């Protein structure tokens, strides 16, 4: 199942059976020969082709021998490899279910000359080689008739819908869990102290890792603009907020390294970020009386930077939790 | 959406005179293939539009040679060598370059002629209006030109603006003059209270407004 | 080639109407269908387009959400559905065939008229009028015929077997509050009006109403 | 104009056995049929006209050509390429607001340069540039890469200026009168000057990076 | 079939990035040792140059009849940057010496604090400590190598 190119490759046996009125005999006249195998290229055959072919062959090409019975019954079960186009929907990738179809019908004979009968509505899976990547939920053929502007008659067809469910363990382990582990680190920058000299390293690493994983997802899914994978939306939103965190981190580092020799602290800054916000954030500054003015204002700038970090530590945690639940919870409920 | 503006809003030009309609785009509407897709449509009254020009200059099949187009990135113009009776209508410029594709504002085309003074008239209600329980006062102005017409509903020294209907007629063919029928709906409880009804209309030909009135008291 | 539109519609405010455009004589699925709105006042406003072969659709910003296009390939018909009809939606709607960058709108639908109103079918109330008694009689005088309180359009006014066709000036219908009206005045010799009989006929096919009220001197 | 581009792909049909004196090719319709079309989901069909072509100079040449005018649906690449590119580009100005004492300027500017280079190569793999036309997104990425390289050079110079002391350098008087007095006024800084030489160098470095922060915001804004 | 390549694509995708990375090869010698980011810069330059060499290797045929000139330049720059990394390690080691852990030989004084600064137009302020002398010697060493690399790199063009 090529999701990027939106093609399904299948190996099927095309079971066909019709009646030939000139290929009848009496077994009593031929030593009780009841049936024979003949090259299928020596007899008339229906011209069933796959309408939605893509990168393959329209008709059967192997041309195995046909089984002919004394009453005129012809059985022909050739093998075929079909590459058919189907629209891929990866909204819930890697927990996605795909619905790929195959439309079969005679190309040049209309319903009054050749009509199709469903041998069995369900596709046969008695000799199915299990893939390990997809499971067939349902494979049923539907008989349809329709008129084409080419021709005045009605051309029947049988369309098979292959409802296939992806087994998500492989992509879970290889994409989802690494992405979640990186997502766990998005808010950590706001708890790193400004003196460690490693805030930028962490936030930049998170941003670049998320970008790389988004690029990896892009190489898997089709480049269609009708649906957006949930994983892609989550990664994009996380990247946006990580970029915002980098901007805030640059600002906070700038605030931390301010001193009286270069900056002046406004009275309103002092009031707000040394009295009001610390109280609302449940952080209590020790009551310390430093005598050196230059060393005390430097410590006030360092404390103002801590408060700004704590504010955004709270907001990003709330957004991270609300956003994740607001994105994935509803789909998991039906 | 690219905005397309047409000038003039109305283009009076007598028979046989050169006509010039201009269209401008809010953005360049050129395309890569060497063409910019601008088309001119003409609609006669009570009819569906009709194609005249496409791709700025290329002329549609079956249209008179008199029509021609020209322009550049954001300025285009239509030209009519000679005007005729069939030529009367509204002309629109259509841009087919940037999605969504938009129409021009429309440039009505008229034929100018010797202006004629309006023939104002006033008709009081009839007996049927009295029986039904209403009073309809209507003012007529026929065979006047140009659109420089204003009508004022002055009644016994009072100017009333409420309940005034504006309904004029498009330029005709035999006379090529307009008309303007203004009505004032009065109730019986109020119709008889007032005494004098007048219809003041002013036109370019006669600077002094023309006066036509009748008195209820008789 | 021919685009056949559905018939005229009258709808109540807040309802939704669906008009259809049927194209024959060409590959219906390979030409875009353009929908154009023409308010009775003035102007052509493109609503949007749909390519029947695919589901592709575009809308102008003014109509995003107001209109929705659907197409049936089996029957060569395209549909436009208008939702939440207000009084502004009353207009004549056109469907046109278009191929971007190659063929302009060379074929148009006849036009479908949509009227949004709360009224119901009402016969006309023709009230013929004559010149006021307090009015000087001169060589040339104007006659009076009034039709009001009718709905919906149209109403044809003519003289007795076209007795006096030329020289008549009918006017477009207008709404006083909810119903339509109409006025019609003609010029006749002062020596022929009292001697000869002049009358205005009224026909209202919507209400299947025909009236004939002669006007006599006051 | 990728991903807001419109493609004009043609399909020429001829007989590679017979010429115009033997078979004449005629169009049954002026457009290709879409009666049994399955929409793409990535490409939008605009127009499929057909034309019959002859050669006034050859007289043995006849062909029928269909023009496939298709329009890309840009949401996918918008979301997956343009937004990440804009996010990375927005970081190209931050190095000039990062204080020197933090000791992290090089990391930031180098990381931005790495990300931009990777994106340029990926874009080239998707839509290859050619002499006829270079994608505008690729042009912008290259211009931003040049700017980020210039910013790395400027950051190195600013860091050199920041770590200067009287024990190793002497401040020329013109450096004083310019960077400590005049340029700050133009940039609305107003050195507090409440009261040493080491702090003077620290202010000169801070003045230099502020000047470039203005330009990069200006140029990046002009990059719109 | 004498054919000529249209070089715009590979210009944009290989040449401009390569020259941009090469222009940073000498910056490490102008970066003060106190910033604590010399290793980051020089190592990043080395790894970027190596990556671009590997990309070129993946593009061209794996034949040994000739070497592309661009590959030759990338290899030369890679050797130069490795030399710069070793020199930066030595300069950092010299910078962080102190009177408690190291003693400065008199020849080190006469050379690095007196003669070489005059040759390089450095002009030690000498307003007046021993730890500052080590920090100055490191400044002189990497200023000397800045001159060498510029000449060896300017002749690279
Ligand atoms: C898509 O590409 C095709 C092929 O390049 C374009 O077709 C070319 O279009 C031009 C412009 O219409 C044609 O030239 C014009 O031809 C007419 C009629 O012969 C002539 O009167 C004009 O003076 C001009 O010469 C050109 O012949 C035509 N070429 C071919 C091979 O068909 C097409 O316009 C492009 N469409 C879009 C939407 O990009
Ligand atoms: C003919 O062969 C069939 C098996 O193919 C067997 O069942 C049947 O009895 C045979 N009849 C005779 C007459 O030999
Ligand atoms: C799959 O697609 C076919 C044809 O479009 C439709 O009949 C069927 O209901 C679909 N089934 C599911 C599970 O989507
Ligand atoms: C008659 C003929 O060749 O028809 C081919 C097309 N089809 C399968 C849609 C009818
Ligand atoms: Na890295």
Angle, to 10 degrees, between the axis of helix D83-90 and the axis of helix A199-218? 160
Asked if E120 and E143 count as a contact pair (C-beta separation under 8 A), the reply is yes
Cβ burial, residue A120 (10 Å; 0-12/13-18/19+): exposed
The secondary element (H helix, E strand) that includes residue D66 is strand D62-72
Asked if E66 and E128 count as a contact pair (C-beta separation under 8 A), the reply is no
Q: Do D29 and C73 touch (CB under 8 A)?
A: no
Asked if A264 and A294 count as a contact pair (C-beta separation under 8 A), the reply is no
Question: What CA–CA distance (Å, rounded) separates A145 from A289?
Answer: 91
Structure tokens at B21: 């309609």
Q: What is the dihedral of CA E97, E101, E106, E108, to 10 degrees?
A: -30
Cβ-proximal residues to C170 (8 Å cutoff; 6+ apart), any chain: B169, C157, C182, C183, C184
- Measured by CA distance, the residue closest to atom 3 of ligand 4 is A108
Question: What CA–CA distance (Å, rounded) separates B201 from B141?
Answer: 9
Cβ burial, residue C69 (10 Å; 0-12/13-18/19+): buried
The DSSP result for E30-55, as a single string, is GS-GGGS-HHHHHHHHHHHHHHHHHH
Q: How many residues does chain D have?
A: 224
Q: How far is CA A249 from CA A170, A194, A209, C113, in A?
A: 36, 9, 18, 63
Question: What CA–CA distance (Å, rounded) separates E26 from E41?
Answer: 10
Q: Do B140 and C142 touch (CB under 8 A)?
A: yes
Chain C residues inside the 8 Å CB shell of D34: 27, 29-30, 51-54
Q: Which residue in C146, C187, C190 has the most chain B C-beta atoms within 10 A of its own C-beta, making it the best mutation to test that interface?
A: C146
Asked if A100 and A144 count as a contact pair (C-beta separation under 8 A), the reply is no
The DSSP result for C144-185, as a single string, is BEEEEEEBSS--EEEETTSTT-TTEEE----BSSSSEEEEEE
The two domains B1-113 and B115-214 share their CATH topology (first three levels equal):
yes
Tell me which method was used to determine the 3D structure.
cryo-EM
Cβ burial, residue C50 (10 Å; 0-12/13-18/19+): buried
DSSP annotation of A124 reads P
Q: What residues are paired with B108 via a beta bridge?
A: B10, B90
What is the least distance, in Å, from the CA of B16 to any CA of chain C? 26
Query: What is the residue whose two structure tokens read 């329709």?
Result: A146
Query: How many of the other CB atoms lie within 10 Å of CB of D61?
Result: 13
Verify whether ligand 1 is closer than 6 Å to residue D67 (CB atom): yes
Chain C residues inside the 8 Å CB shell of D30: 103
Q: Binding residue per annotation — A3?
A: yes
Alpha carbon A47 to chain centroid distance?
Answer: 36
Closest Cβ opposite residue D45 in set C51, C73, C102: C51
Structure tokens at B65: 């040679």
Structure tokens at C150: 């009718």
CA of residue B100 to ligand 1 center, whole Å: 23
Asked if C46 and C36 count as a contact pair (C-beta separation under 8 A), the reply is yes
Q: How far is CA B168 from CA B14, B109, B186, C173, in A?
A: 22, 17, 21, 10
Question: What CA–CA distance (Å, rounded) separates A98 from A88?
Answer: 6
Query: How many of the other CB atoms lie within 10 Å of CB of C89?
Result: 20
DSSP annotation of E4 reads -
Q: How far is CA D124 from CA A24, B189, C77, E10, E107, in A?
A: 66, 84, 45, 10, 57
Q: What is the resolution of this structure in A?
A: 2.3
CA of residue A76 to ligand 2 center, whole Å: 23
User: Does any CB of chain D come closer than 8 Å to the CB of residue E5?
Assistant: no
- Measured by CA distance, the residue closest to atom 10 of ligand 4 is A107
Chain C residues inside the 8 Å CB shell of B50: 108
Verify whether ligand 3 is closer than 6 Å to residue A99 (CB atom): yes
Asked if B18 and B79 count as a contact pair (C-beta separation under 8 A), the reply is yes
Question: What CA–CA distance (Å, rounded) separates A15 from A80?
Answer: 11
Structure tokens at E35: 């910033």
Asked if B195 and B180 count as a contact pair (C-beta separation under 8 A), the reply is no
State how beta strands D62-72 and D50-54 pair: antiparallel
Which residue intervals of chain A bear CATH 2.70.170.10? 1-167
Cβ-proximal residues to C141 (8 Å cutoff; 6+ apart), any chain: C131, C187, C188, C190, C193
Chain D residues inside the 8 Å CB shell of A87: 41
Q: Do D41 and A250 touch (CB under 8 A)?
A: no
DSSP annotation of E23 reads T
Residue C69 CA neighbour count, 13 Å, CB half: 26
Backbone φ and ψ for C71, nearest 5 degrees, come out as -135, 145
Question: What CA–CA distance (Å, rounded) separates C176 from B183?
Answer: 9
Cβ-proximal residues to D126 (8 Å cutoff; 6+ apart), any chain: D2, D77, D81
Closest to B40 in 3D by CA, of B48, B50, B30: B50
Question: What CA–CA distance (Å, rounded) separates A241 from A318?
Answer: 12
Verify whether ligand 4 is closer than 6 Å to residue A154 (CB atom): no
The secondary element (H helix, E strand) that includes residue A156 is strand A154-166
Ligand 4 nearest-atom number relative to CA A106 = 8
Chain C residues inside the 8 Å CB shell of D49: 99, 102-103
Closest residue of chain A to D44, computed from CA coordinates: A225
Q: How many residues does chain C have?
A: 218
Using a CB cutoff of 8 Å and minimum separation of 24, what contacts does B50-57 make? B50/C108, B51/C104, B51/C105, B51/C106, B52/B78, B52/B91, B53/B78, B54/C104
User: Does any CB of chain B come closer than 8 Å to the CB of residue C171?
Assistant: yes
Task: Report the side by side order of strands in the sheet with C209-214.
Answer: C156-159, C199-204, C209-214
Question: What CA–CA distance (Å, rounded) separates B106 from B8?
Answer: 9
Closest Cβ opposite residue C101 in set D33, D39, D69: D69
DSSP H helices, chain A, are 169-171, 177-183, 199-218, 230-256, 267-271, 277-280, 293-332
Question: What CA–CA distance (Å, rounded) separates C7 from A323?
Answer: 52
Angle, to 10 degrees, between the axis of helix E38-59 and the axis of helix D105-126? 10
Question: Which of helix, strand or coil describes residue A12?
Answer: strand
Question: What CA–CA distance (Å, rounded) separates C51 from A73?
Answer: 48
Asked if E39 and D165 count as a contact pair (C-beta separation under 8 A), the reply is no
Q: What is the dihedral of CA D67, D68, D74, D80, to 10 degrees?
A: -110
Cβ-proximal residues to D190 (8 Å cutoff; 6+ apart), any chain: D184
Closest Cβ opposite residue C30 in set D31, D39, D44: D31
Question: What CA–CA distance (Å, rounded) separates B155 from D83?
Answer: 69
Question: What CA–CA distance (Å, rounded) separates C163 from B152?
Answer: 35
Q: What is the dihedral of CA E16, E22, E24, E28, to 10 degrees?
A: 170
Cβ-proximal residues to A205 (8 Å cutoff; 6+ apart), any chain: none
Closest residue of chain D to E20, computed from CA coordinates: D149
Closest to D102 in 3D by CA, of E20, A195, C199: A195
Q: What residues are paired with C24 via a beta bridge?
A: C2
Query: How many of the other CB atoms lie within 10 Å of CB of B44?
Result: 13
Structure tokens at A54: 């893509």
Instruction: Name the class of domain B115-214.
Output: mainly beta
- Domain parsing of chain B, residue ranges: 1-113, 115-214
Q: How far is CA D214 from CA C25, D1, D38, D220, in A?
A: 65, 30, 53, 10
User: Does any CB of chain D come closer than 8 Å to the CB of residue A49?
Assistant: no
Closest Cβ opposite residue C176 in set B119, B132, B185: B185
CA of residue A40 to ligand 2 center, whole Å: 25
Q: How far is CA D54 from CA A57, B55, D28, D31, in A?
A: 34, 24, 17, 18
The DSSP result for chain C, as a single string, is -EEEE---EEE-TT--EEEEEEEESS-GGGSEEEEEEE-SSS--EEEEEE-TTS--EEE-GGGBTTEEEEEETTTTEEEEEE-S--STT-EEEEEEEEBTTTB----B---EEEEE-S---B--EE--B---SSS---SEEE-BEEEEEEBSS--EEEETTSTT-TTEEE----BSSSSEEEEEEEEEETTTTTTS--EEEEEETTTTEEEEEE----
Question: Which of helix, strand or coil describes residue B196?
Answer: strand
Q: Which domains does chain C have, with CATH numbers?
A: 1-118 (no CATH), 119-217 (2.60.40.10)
Question: What CA–CA distance (Å, rounded) separates A19 from A13?
Answer: 20
Verify whether ligand 2 is closer than 6 Å to residue A174 (CB atom): no
- The preferred substitution site among A29, A30, A32 for testing ligand 2, maximizing ligand atoms within 8 Å of CB, is A32
Q: Do A224 and D104 touch (CB under 8 A)?
A: no
- The preferred substitution site among A161, A162, A163, A165 for testing ligand 3, maximizing ligand atoms within 8 Å of CB, is A161
Cβ-proximal residues to A29 (8 Å cutoff; 6+ apart), any chain: none
Query: Quick one: which ligand is closest to A157's CA?
Result: 4
Closest to C33 in 3D by CA, of C65, C4, C63: C4
Question: What CA–CA distance (Å, rounded) separates E42 from E50?
Answer: 12
CA of residue A107 to ligand 4 center, whole Å: 5
Question: What CA–CA distance (Å, rounded) separates B185 from B164?
Answer: 8
Q: Which domain holds residue E119?
A: 7-157
CATH number belonging to domain B1-113? 2.60.40.10
The answer to whether the bond into B95 is cis (omega within 30° of 0) is: no
Question: What CA–CA distance (Å, rounded) separates B127 from A227?
Answer: 71
DSSP annotation of B51 reads E
Q: How many residues does chain E have?
A: 157
The total number of structural domains in chain E stands at: 1
Question: Which of helix, strand or coil describes residue B141?
Answer: strand
Cβ burial, residue E35 (10 Å; 0-12/13-18/19+): buried
> First CA to last CA across chain B, in angstroms?
62
Q: How many residues does chain A have?
A: 334
Cβ-proximal residues to A328 (8 Å cutoff; 6+ apart), any chain: A230, A234
Closest residue of chain D to E38, computed from CA coordinates: D106
Closest Cβ opposite residue C176 in set B43, B51, B165: B165
The secondary element (H helix, E strand) that includes residue A153 is none
Closest to D73 in 3D by CA, of C170, C128, A228: A228
Asked if A65 and A40 count as a contact pair (C-beta separation under 8 A), the reply is yes
Question: Which of helix, strand or coil describes residue B159?
Answer: strand
The answer to whether the bond into B8 is cis (omega within 30° of 0) is: yes
Chain E residues inside the 8 Å CB shell of D165: 132
Cβ-proximal residues to B6 (8 Å cutoff; 6+ apart), any chain: B21, B22, B23, B91, B92, B93, B104, B105, B106, B107
Ligand 2 nearest-atom number relative to CA A32 = 1
- Measured by CA distance, the residue closest to atom 6 of ligand 3 is A161
Closest residue of chain D to E14, computed from CA coordinates: D121
Angle, to 10 degrees, between the axis of helix D83-90 and the axis of helix D105-126? 160
Query: What is the residue whose two structure tokens read 């330029």?
Result: B171
State how beta strands C145-150 and C199-204 pair: unpaired
Question: What CA–CA distance (Å, rounded) separates D91 from D216?
Answer: 11
Closest to E91 in 3D by CA, of E23, E42, E152: E42
The fold of A1-167 is: Acetylcholine Binding Protein; Chain: A, (2.70.170)
Question: What CA–CA distance (Å, rounded) separates A150 from E58?
Answer: 51
């Amino acid at each position: 199942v090529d999701e990027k190119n939106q093609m399904m490759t299948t190996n099927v046996w095309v079971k066909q059976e019709w009646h030939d009125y000139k290929l009848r005999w009496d077994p009593a006249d031929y030593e009780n020969v009841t049936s024979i195998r003949i090259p299928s290229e020596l007899i008339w055959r229906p011209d069933i082709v796959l309408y939605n072919n893509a990168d393959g062959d329209f008709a059967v090409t192997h041309l195995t021998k046909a089984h002919l019975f004394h009453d005129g019954r012809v059985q022909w079960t050739p093998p075929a490899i079909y590459k058919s186009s189907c629209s891929i929907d990866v909204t819930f990738f890697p927990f996605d279910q795909q619905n790929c179809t195959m439309k079969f019908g005679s190309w040049t004979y209309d319903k009054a000359k050749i009509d199709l009968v469903n041998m069995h509505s369900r596709v046969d899976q008695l000799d199915f080689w299990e893939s390990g990547e997809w499971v067939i939920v349902d494979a049923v053929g539907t008989y349809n008739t329709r008129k084409y502007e080419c021709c005045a008659e009605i051309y029947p067809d049988i369309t098979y819908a292959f409802v296939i469910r992806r087994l998500p363990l492989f992509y879970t382990i290889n994409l989802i869990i690494p992405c979640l582990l990186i997502s766990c680190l998005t808010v950590l920058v706001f708890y790193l102290p400004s003196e460690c000299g490693e805030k930028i390293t962490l936030c930049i690493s998170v941003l670049l890792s998320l970008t790389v994983f988004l690029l990896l997802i892009t190489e898997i899914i089709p480049s269609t603009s009708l649906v957006i994978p949930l994983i892609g939306e989550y990664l994009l939103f996380t990247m946006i907020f990580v970029t915002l965190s980098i901007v805030i981190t640059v600002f906070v580092l700038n605030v931390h390294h301010r001193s009286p020799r270069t900056h002046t602290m406004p009275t309103w800054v002092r009031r707000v970020f040394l009295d009001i916000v610390p109280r609302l954030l449940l952080m209590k500054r020790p009551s310390v009386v430093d005598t050196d003015f230059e060393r005390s204002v430097k410590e006030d700038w360092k404390y103002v930077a801590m408060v700004i970090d704590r504010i955004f530590l709270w907001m990003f945690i709330i957004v991270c939790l609300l956003g994740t639940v607001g994105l994935f919870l509803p789909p998991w409920l039906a | 959406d690219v905005l397309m503006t047409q000038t003039p809003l109305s283009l009076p030009v007598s028979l046989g005179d050169q006509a010039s309609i201009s269209c401008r785009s809010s953005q360049s509407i050129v395309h890569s293939n060497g063409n910019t897709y601008l088309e001119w449509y003409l609609q006669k009254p009570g009819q569906s539009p009709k194609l005249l020009i496409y791709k700025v200059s290329n002329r549609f099949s079956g249209v008179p040679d008199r029509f021609s187009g020209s322009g550049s990135g954001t300025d285009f113009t239509l030209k009519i060598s000679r005007v005729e009776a069939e030529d009367l209508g509204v002309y629109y410029c259509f841009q087919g370059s940037h999605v969504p594709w938009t129409f021009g504002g429309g440039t009505k085309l008229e034929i100018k002629r010797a202006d004629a003074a309006p023939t104002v008239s006033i008709f009081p209600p009839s007996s049927e209006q009295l029986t039904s329980g209403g009073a309809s006062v209507v003012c007529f102005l026929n065979n006047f030109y140009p659109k420089d017409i204003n009508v004022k509903w002055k009644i016994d020294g009072s100017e009333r603006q409420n309940g005034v209907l504006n309904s004029w007629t498009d330029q005709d063919s035999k006379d090529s003059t307009y008309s303007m029928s203004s009505t004032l709906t009065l109730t019986k409880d109020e119709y008889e209270r007032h005494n004098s009804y007048t219809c003041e209309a002013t036109h370019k030909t006669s600077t002094s407004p023309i006066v036509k009135s009748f008195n209820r008291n008789e | 080639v021919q685009l056949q539109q559905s018939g005229a519609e009258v709808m109540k405010p807040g309802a939704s109407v669906k008009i259809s455009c049927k194209g024959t004589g060409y590959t219906f699925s390979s030409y875009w269908i353009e929908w154009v709105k023409q308010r009775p006042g003035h102007g052509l406003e493109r609503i949007g387009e749909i390519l029947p072969g695919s589901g592709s659709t575009n809308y102008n910003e003014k109509f995003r959400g107001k209109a929705t296009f659907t197409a049936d390939k089996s029957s060569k018909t395209a549909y436009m559905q208008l939702s939440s009809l207000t009084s502004e939606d009353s207009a004549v709607y056109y469907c046109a065939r278009y191929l971007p960058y190659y063929y302009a709108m060379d074929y148009w639908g006849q036009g479908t008229s949509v009227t949004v109103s709360s009224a119901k079918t009402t016969p006309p109330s023709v009230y013929p009028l004559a010149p006021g008694s307090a009015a000087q009689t001169n060589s040339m005088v104007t006659l009076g015929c009034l039709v009001k309180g009718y709905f919906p359009e149209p109403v044809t006014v003519t003289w007795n077997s076209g007795s006096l066709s030329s020289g008549v000036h009918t006017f477009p219908a207008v709404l006083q509050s909810d119903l339509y009206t109409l006025s019609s005045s003609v010029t006749v010799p002062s020596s022929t009006w009292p001697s000869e009989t002049v009358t205005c006929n009224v026909a209202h096919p919507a209400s299947s109403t025909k009236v004939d009220k002669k006007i006599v001197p006051r | 104009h990728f991903p807001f581009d419109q493609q004009n792909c043609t399909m020429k049909f001829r007989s590679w056995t017979y010429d115009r004196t033997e078979i004449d090719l005629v169009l049954k319709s002026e457009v290709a049929s879409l009666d049994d079309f399955t929409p793409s989901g990535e490409w939008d069909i605009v127009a499929l006209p057909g034309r019959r072509n002859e050669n006034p100079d050859d007289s043995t040449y006849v062909d029928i050509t269909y023009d496939f005018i298709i329009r890309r649906k840009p949401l996918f690449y918008t979301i997956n390429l343009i937004i990440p590119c804009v996010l990375i580009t927005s970081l190209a100005i931050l190095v000039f607001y990062l204080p020197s004492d933090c000791g992290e300027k090089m990391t930031l500017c180098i990381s931005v340069l790495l990300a931009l280079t990777v994106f340029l190569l990926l874009i080239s793999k998707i839509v290859p540039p050619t002499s006829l036309d270079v994608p505008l997104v690729g042009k912008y990425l290259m211009f931003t890469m040049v700017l980020v390289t210039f910013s790395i050079v400027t950051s190195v110079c600013v860091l050199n200026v920041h770590h200067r002391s009287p024990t190793t350098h002497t401040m020329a008087p013109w450096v004083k009168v310019v960077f400590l007095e005049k340029l700050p006024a133009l940039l609305f800084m107003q050195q507090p000057r409440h009261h040493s030489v080491s702090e003077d160098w620290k202010y000169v470095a801070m003045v230099i990076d502020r000047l470039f922060l203005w330009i990069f915001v200006f140029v990046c804004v002009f990059g719109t």
